[PDB]
Amino acid sequence: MNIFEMLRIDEGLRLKIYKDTEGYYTIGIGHLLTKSPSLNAAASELDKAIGRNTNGVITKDEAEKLFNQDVDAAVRGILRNAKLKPVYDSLDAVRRAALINMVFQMGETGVAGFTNSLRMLQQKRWDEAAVNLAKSRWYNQTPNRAKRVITTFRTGTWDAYK
Ligand SMILES: [Cl-]
Ligand SMILES: [Cl-]
Secondary structure (H helix, E strand, C coil), X not given: CCHHHHXXXXXXXXXXXXXXXXXXXXXXXXXXXXXXXXXXXXXXXXXXHHCCCCXXXXXXXXXXXXXXXXXXXXXXXXXXXXXXXXXXXXXXXXXXXXXXXXXXXXXXXHHHCCHHHHHHHHHCCHXXXXXXXXCCHHHHHCHHHHHHHHHHHHHCCCHHHC
């Protein structure tokens, strides 16, 4: 297991524009297109992202391309963020995958806002951090996914994904 397989499990793969759990236009492996309600604004961002007139549909290769960019940007954002970098640096390899996952779903800004859980992870207080992480809109809104990430942070293993 690795970050790619983990996120592919959490986000799925759709080749047609769809709406995410928050109702925003998305495509591929959880690639958010836009927060606007306009399917047209969404189709525009899509074409812009792919470099072609897509008519709302992409191939698998294209999706995976967006995916690779997305993961890379997730990691780069973490290393560029003063609040997140130190946590990341402190973690072991599996746990790092869990922080990336959060950043990918909720953005650097959202994650950075989990101040207390971040401090706990940095201190390696696994069970405490797990409890704190769960007291969040994130967990209430996408509980199955949140549990998997949380368990990953708690155990430092990939069990939740096996
Ligand atoms: Cl893009
Ligand atoms: Cl879920």
